[PDB]
Amino acid sequence: MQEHYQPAAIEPAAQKKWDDARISNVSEDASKPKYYCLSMFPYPSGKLHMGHVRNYTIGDVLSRFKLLNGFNVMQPMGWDAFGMPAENAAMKNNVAPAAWTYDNIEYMKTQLKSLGFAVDWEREVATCKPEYYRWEQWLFTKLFEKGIVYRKNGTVNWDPVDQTVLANEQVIDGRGWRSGALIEKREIPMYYFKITDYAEELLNDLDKLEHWPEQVKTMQRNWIGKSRGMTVRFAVSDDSKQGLEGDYAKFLQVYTTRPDTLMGATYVAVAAEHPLATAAAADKPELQAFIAECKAGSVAEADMATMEKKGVPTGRYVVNPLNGDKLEVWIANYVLWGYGDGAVMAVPAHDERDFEFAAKYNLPKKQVIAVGDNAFDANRWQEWYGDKENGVLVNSGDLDGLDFQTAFDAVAAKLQSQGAGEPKTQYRLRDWGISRQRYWGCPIPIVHCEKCGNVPVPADQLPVVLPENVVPDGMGSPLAKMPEFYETSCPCCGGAAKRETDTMDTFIESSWYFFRYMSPKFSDGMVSAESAKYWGAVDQYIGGIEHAIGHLLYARFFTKLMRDEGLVNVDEPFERLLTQGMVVCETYYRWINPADVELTAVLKADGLPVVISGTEKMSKSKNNGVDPQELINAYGADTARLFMMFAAPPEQSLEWSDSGVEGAHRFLRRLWRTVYEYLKQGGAVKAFAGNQDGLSKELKDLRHKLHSTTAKVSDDYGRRQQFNTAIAAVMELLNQYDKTDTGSEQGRAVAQEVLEAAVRLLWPIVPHICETLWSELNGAKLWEAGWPTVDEAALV
Ligand SMILES: [Mg+2]
Ligand SMILES: [Zn+2]
C-alpha cells in the first residue's frame, strides 16, 4: 500500500476492475429485488458542466447504496440528442448537426467513464438514432389513426427576417430576439397531442403518488387547471342586439367558477374576437384599435398575469338572469378567445383581479359575500374577499345566508330552470402542439396526398429516416428545401406525395426514454413485453428543476398512453422524485472565467486585476462556467463527487468554492493515511463481533458512535436523501476514532470494524478510494460484504 493518496493511480484501475466483473450490467433477474435509479439524461452540449456532475453523482450515490443492499440496480444513461443547439453549432461551425452531435457524445461518454458512475453502458441510447425515434414515429401513427394525435390550423409567431416560427419566450416588444423584426401571427397547420382527453386521469393519479413532493403535485394540478363552475347566459338588451346575429344577438354566455357571486356582477368582459366586440367596434375606431392591440400581443403563459389588465367598454348591455341589473359589456385583454366561452363576468368585490380592474375604471363593487362581522372596505382589498369556504351571501335577496356549496347548487337550480344557465366542468389545460419547423429533430410520419389527405407512414416503412448529411444555412426549415427527401409516393394510392417536412418537439423523446432503457435493442416494439413487467416504473428520478410542468407531465401522459396500448402496466412513470439545486459560481469582468483567475483579484495569466461581480447560476453568459474536466485533472474524480455531495444537500443550491474543493481532497488524503497508518501498525485483523460486555469503556463508546453513524448514514441515503450530513456523520465517527487508544488486541478488532464500515458507508460517495482501502482491509468482494449492519447492542 502506497503511503500517500495518488488518485490517478487507483481510479482508472478501480474502473477496469468494475468492468471486469461487469457489476453494473444488469438484466431481468426476478431473484433480487429490482431498483430502477434514473438520472435525467443530458443533451450533448459538448463537454459536461458542473451541473451534470451533481445530477449523476446524486444518482450514483443512491444506486451504489441500493446495490450494496442487494438490489438489482438499473442506472442507464443516454443522450437527448435532438435540439436546436446542434443546428446553431451547424450554422456557425459549418458542421453537420449529426456529426457535431456524435463528436459531442463520445467526449462526454469518456468524461462520464472518468467519474466512475456505475452505469449500465449496455443500455446506452441516443435519440437521434433511427433505432430509437422510429418508435415515437410508430406511436405517432397509431395515435394519429386513433385521433389522439391530429392535425389542425393554429396561430403561431413567424419571424419574417430570420424565417422561422418563434415561441413567446423569444418575442420582445413584438420582435424576435435575434433579428429584432416585427413578428407576424400566422395560421399554419400543426399536429397536436389530444392531452386534454387524458386531463382527468393526469389529475387524479397524482393522488396515488405518495412520495411525490406536494409542491410539485400542486403545480401539475394548476397547469391542468380543473374547475367545477357554472355556464351563465346573459341576455343581450334590446338596445344592443344591433350587429349581432343568431344566438349572439339573443344572449351572452360566460363561464364562472364562483356563481355564488352572480348577484355581485357589475360588468362583463368579452374577448377581442367576440362578435359583441366586432359589432360594437363596427363604427368606433378606438375600439377597433384596441381589438388590434390585443391580437398583435403575444403574452407568454409564464408571463400571462404580468400584463397590466386593460379594456374599453362597448356601449352594449347584457342583462343578469337573476337580479335583472343591466350590465355593460367590455372588451378586455385578459379574456382569451378559444379559452372556453370567450367571455367572463366580473365581481370586483370578491376577485382580486376584478377588484384591481374596477378600481382602475371606477366601476361598481357590489359585495355579496360576508365572512363574519368583518368590515367591507370597497377601496382596499382584503383576503376575506376571495373566500369560498367561510362566507355566506349578503345583498343577494333570498340567497342571503347560504354557504358557497349550497349557493352554488341553488343558483344552478334557478339558472337551469330558466335555461339561462348550467353547471360545467372546465380545464385550463390546452392540447399539446408538437410541430417544430426545424430540421434537427424527429421527422413526423405523415405523407400528404391531394387525393388521400394526410396519410401516415405504415409500420412497415418506419422509420422515416432523417438525413444526416445536412448543414442548415439559417433561412427556414432545411428539410422543406430538400425534394430528394420530401418527394415520395402516397402509401395509400401511389401518386405523387410530399412528406411532412416538420420535426417533432424534442420533448417527445424525453417523455418515454425511461421505458426504452428496459430493452433498448428490442426490435419488435417500443419496450419489450417481458422487460416492462420486471422493471415496472422508475423507482427514483433525479434531474434539474427546469421544465417540470412540461416534461414531467408529458412523461405521465405518454406513460398512460403507452399503458393503454399493452406496452406497459404502470399508470405512473416515476415513483420517487428528487430535484437537485443549481450549481452557482461567482462572475468576473474587466466576462472572465473563474478557471483562469486568482484572488488577492487578479488574472491567472497576466496578473491583471479584474473585478468580481455577483454570483449567477453556472452559465456561459457571465463566463462563470467551471469545467469539471479541469476539476478532475487537479484532484480526481473522487474529490469532485465528494465535494458535490458535501457542499450542500441535493435540494439546496451549491456555491462553488475552490477552497471547499481542496477541503474535500484533504479529507480523502486523511482517509487514505488513516487506513494506511492502521495497517502499518500490525497489518489487518478480524473485525469485532458480538457481545461487548468485556471491552474497555473507551471502546464501548466508539462502537456506539460506529453503529450510531451506521444508522444515520443509512437514513441519510434511503430516507432523507441528505448526503452532506451523511459525510459529516462519517467524519465525526473518524474524529472519535482518532481520539481513541486502539493499540490493544480488542482495540485493533474494533478499529477494523470502524474502518471496514467507514469505507463502506462512503463507497457510494467516493467508490474508487473506498474500493481501494477496502481491498487492503478485507479480501472479500466488497459487494459480497454488503451495506454495514447496525448492531443495536452497541447502542444500549
Ligand atoms: Mg400507492
Ligand atoms: Zn394518395
XYZ file of N, CA and C in Angstrom, residues 463-565:
309
model
N -38.511 3.341 -39.787
C -38.582 4.794 -39.589
C -38.579 5.619 -40.872
N -39.165 6.813 -40.800
C -38.940 7.851 -41.802
C -37.603 8.496 -41.449
N -36.554 8.139 -42.188
C -35.197 8.467 -41.772
C -34.929 9.952 -41.972
N -34.365 10.583 -40.950
C -33.870 11.947 -41.080
C -32.490 11.930 -41.726
N -32.271 12.694 -42.795
C -30.930 12.754 -43.386
C -29.937 13.402 -42.433
N -28.764 12.781 -42.314
C -27.689 13.340 -41.506
C -26.742 14.221 -42.307
N -26.685 14.046 -43.628
C -25.802 14.838 -44.483
C -26.464 16.168 -44.851
N -26.726 16.967 -43.820
C -27.370 18.266 -43.963
C -26.605 19.276 -43.122
N -26.462 20.490 -43.642
C -25.953 21.613 -42.860
C -26.944 22.763 -43.002
N -27.667 23.123 -41.942
C -28.625 24.232 -42.047
C -27.911 25.550 -42.298
N -28.438 26.325 -43.245
C -27.885 27.649 -43.512
C -28.457 28.685 -42.551
N -29.774 28.674 -42.360
C -30.417 29.594 -41.444
C -31.794 30.031 -41.899
N -32.010 30.062 -43.212
C -33.270 30.536 -43.783
C -34.277 29.393 -43.793
N -35.068 29.306 -42.727
C -36.181 28.381 -42.681
C -35.768 26.940 -42.456
N -36.770 26.071 -42.509
C -36.565 24.642 -42.335
C -35.744 24.083 -43.490
N -34.560 23.524 -43.234
C -33.767 22.957 -44.336
C -34.420 21.759 -45.002
N -35.347 21.075 -44.325
C -36.000 19.916 -44.923
C -37.003 20.307 -46.000
N -37.653 21.464 -45.858
C -38.568 21.945 -46.886
C -37.853 22.319 -48.176
N -36.527 22.431 -48.150
C -35.731 22.753 -49.324
C -35.062 21.526 -49.929
N -35.452 20.323 -49.501
C -34.828 19.074 -49.934
C -35.877 18.196 -50.608
N -36.118 18.391 -51.907
C -37.040 17.488 -52.616
C -36.573 16.046 -52.622
N -35.259 15.807 -52.608
C -34.749 14.445 -52.503
C -35.258 13.733 -51.256
N -35.741 14.482 -50.264
C -36.348 13.910 -49.067
C -37.869 13.860 -49.170
N -38.513 15.010 -49.389
C -39.963 15.079 -49.244
C -40.722 14.514 -50.440
N -40.096 14.401 -51.609
C -40.771 13.813 -52.760
C -40.855 12.300 -52.585
N -42.074 11.771 -52.612
C -42.310 10.346 -52.423
C -43.657 10.001 -53.045
N -44.009 8.720 -52.988
C -45.288 8.236 -53.483
C -46.240 8.013 -52.314
N -47.514 8.323 -52.532
C -48.504 8.179 -51.471
C -48.661 6.711 -51.095
N -48.515 6.358 -49.815
C -48.609 4.946 -49.412
C -50.016 4.372 -49.462
N -51.029 5.161 -49.814
C -52.401 4.677 -49.859
C -52.981 4.609 -51.265
N -52.278 5.119 -52.274
C -52.783 5.065 -53.641
C -51.640 4.915 -54.635
N -50.526 5.597 -54.383
C -49.343 5.500 -55.221
C -48.951 6.776 -55.937
N -49.813 7.786 -55.996
C -49.495 9.010 -56.698
C -48.412 9.820 -56.003
N -48.070 10.944 -56.630
C -47.059 11.835 -56.076
C -47.510 12.374 -54.724
N -46.546 12.558 -53.825
C -46.870 12.947 -52.461
C -45.656 13.596 -51.812
N -45.924 14.535 -50.910
C -44.884 15.204 -50.141
C -44.883 14.668 -48.716
N -43.697 14.353 -48.203
C -43.568 14.042 -46.788
C -43.704 15.312 -45.957
N -44.140 15.140 -44.712
C -44.168 16.255 -43.775
C -42.739 16.666 -43.442
N -42.402 17.922 -43.722
C -41.045 18.420 -43.556
C -40.796 19.021 -42.178
N -41.759 18.932 -41.269
C -41.549 19.359 -39.896
C -41.058 18.190 -39.049
N -40.468 18.521 -37.907
C -39.991 17.529 -36.959
C -40.724 17.694 -35.634
N -40.753 16.614 -34.858
C -41.463 16.637 -33.591
C -40.732 17.503 -32.571
N -41.483 17.948 -31.568
C -40.883 18.619 -30.425
C -39.872 17.694 -29.763
N -38.665 18.212 -29.521
C -37.646 17.429 -28.830
C -38.100 16.957 -27.454
N -39.219 17.480 -26.948
C -39.815 16.990 -25.712
C -40.318 15.561 -25.848
N -40.609 15.120 -27.076
C -41.235 13.817 -27.292
C -40.319 12.695 -26.814
N -39.042 12.754 -27.200
C -38.110 11.694 -26.832
C -37.946 11.599 -25.320
N -37.914 12.743 -24.633
C -37.729 12.754 -23.187
C -38.930 12.199 -22.433
N -40.076 12.043 -23.092
C -41.301 11.608 -22.436
C -41.451 10.093 -22.376
N -40.555 9.338 -23.004
C -40.674 7.885 -22.972
C -39.339 7.155 -22.930
N -38.202 7.858 -22.877
C -36.908 7.185 -22.971
C -36.653 6.265 -21.781
N -37.247 6.565 -20.624
C -37.088 5.704 -19.457
C -37.694 4.323 -19.671
N -38.610 4.185 -20.628
C -39.163 2.883 -20.978
C -38.288 2.129 -21.966
N -37.604 2.847 -22.859
C -36.712 2.198 -23.811
C -35.513 1.573 -23.112
N -35.046 2.188 -22.020
C -33.892 1.669 -21.285
C -34.086 0.225 -20.846
N -35.331 -0.170 -20.565
C -35.599 -1.533 -20.116
C -35.243 -2.562 -21.181
N -35.306 -2.177 -22.457
C -34.947 -3.063 -23.566
C -34.557 -2.196 -24.752
N -33.366 -1.594 -24.700
C -33.014 -0.564 -25.690
C -32.776 -1.106 -27.089
N -32.530 -2.402 -27.237
C -32.286 -3.003 -28.538
C -33.466 -3.827 -29.034
N -34.586 -3.808 -28.316
C -35.774 -4.559 -28.700
C -36.307 -4.052 -30.035
N -36.420 -4.954 -31.010
C -36.790 -4.583 -32.369
C -38.276 -4.745 -32.666
N -39.050 -5.335 -31.758
C -40.446 -5.654 -32.023
C -41.419 -4.676 -31.374
N -40.931 -3.589 -30.791
C -41.820 -2.631 -30.164
C -41.046 -1.557 -29.432
N -41.813 -0.631 -28.849
C -41.228 0.413 -28.012
C -40.426 -0.194 -26.870
N -41.106 -0.905 -25.977
C -40.481 -1.590 -24.855
C -40.873 -3.060 -24.929
N -39.926 -3.939 -24.609
C -40.193 -5.370 -24.636
C -41.345 -5.719 -23.702
N -42.129 -6.721 -24.107
C -43.261 -7.146 -23.293
C -42.798 -7.719 -21.961
N -41.641 -8.381 -21.950
C -41.200 -9.071 -20.746
C -40.425 -8.151 -19.809
N -39.746 -7.135 -20.345
C -38.902 -6.281 -19.515
C -39.674 -5.157 -18.836
N -40.734 -4.648 -19.470
C -41.575 -3.651 -18.819
C -42.266 -4.211 -17.584
N -42.418 -5.535 -17.504
C -43.018 -6.142 -16.322
C -42.037 -6.163 -15.157
N -40.813 -6.641 -15.398
C -39.845 -6.769 -14.313
C -39.441 -5.411 -13.757
N -39.233 -4.425 -14.627
C -38.802 -3.108 -14.181
C -39.960 -2.217 -13.758
N -41.165 -2.473 -14.263
C -42.329 -1.684 -13.909
C -42.172 -0.213 -14.227
N -41.911 0.592 -13.200
C -41.717 2.024 -13.351
C -40.408 2.429 -12.687
N -40.009 3.678 -12.923
C -38.779 4.198 -12.340
C -38.964 4.359 -10.839
N -38.007 3.845 -10.066
C -38.091 3.954 -8.614
C -37.554 5.286 -8.105
N -36.602 5.891 -8.813
C -36.053 7.179 -8.408
C -35.644 7.971 -9.639
N -36.110 9.216 -9.712
C -35.812 10.123 -10.812
C -35.111 11.351 -10.250
N -33.918 11.642 -10.766
C -33.140 12.806 -10.357
C -32.895 13.671 -11.584
N -33.113 14.972 -11.440
C -32.892 15.876 -12.547
C -32.855 17.314 -12.084
N -32.918 18.223 -13.059
C -32.994 19.638 -12.775
C -34.421 20.092 -12.534
N -34.551 21.364 -12.158
C -35.869 21.932 -11.902
C -36.500 22.545 -13.147
N -35.721 22.790 -14.196
C -36.245 23.460 -15.379
C -37.187 22.540 -16.144
N -38.326 23.094 -16.568
C -39.302 22.387 -17.400
C -39.841 21.140 -16.700
N -40.351 21.335 -15.484
C -41.034 20.265 -14.767
C -42.509 20.195 -15.149
N -43.173 21.352 -15.208
C -44.554 21.408 -15.682
C -44.658 20.812 -17.078
N -43.653 21.056 -17.913
C -43.627 20.493 -19.244
C -43.283 19.017 -19.267
N -42.016 18.694 -18.995
C -41.518 17.339 -19.218
C -42.216 16.323 -18.321
N -42.226 16.571 -17.008
C -42.755 15.590 -16.064
C -44.203 15.237 -16.379
N -45.007 16.234 -16.753
C -46.387 15.963 -17.143
C -46.445 15.116 -18.408
N -45.571 15.404 -19.377
C -45.589 14.666 -20.636
C -45.214 13.206 -20.422
N -44.254 12.946 -19.532
C -43.905 11.566 -19.208
C -45.077 10.848 -18.556
N -45.789 11.535 -17.658
C -47.009 10.973 -17.089
C -48.053 10.729 -18.170
N -48.104 11.604 -19.176
C -49.084 11.455 -20.247
C -48.711 10.306 -21.177
N -47.451 10.263 -21.619
C -47.010 9.192 -22.506
C -47.130 7.829 -21.836
N -46.887 7.769 -20.524
C -46.995 6.503 -19.806
C -48.417 5.961 -19.871
N -49.407 6.823 -19.629
C -50.798 6.386 -19.683
C -51.213 6.042 -21.108
N -50.686 6.769 -22.096
C -50.900 6.397 -23.490
C -50.344 5.009 -23.768
N -49.057 4.811 -23.467
C -48.419 3.520 -23.697
C -49.069 2.418 -22.871
N -49.585 2.757 -21.686
C -50.283 1.766 -20.874
C -51.609 1.361 -21.501
N -52.248 2.267 -22.237
C -53.454 1.939 -22.984
C -53.162 1.212 -24.294
N -51.913 0.797 -24.518
C -51.532 0.053 -25.713
C -50.755 -1.208 -25.356
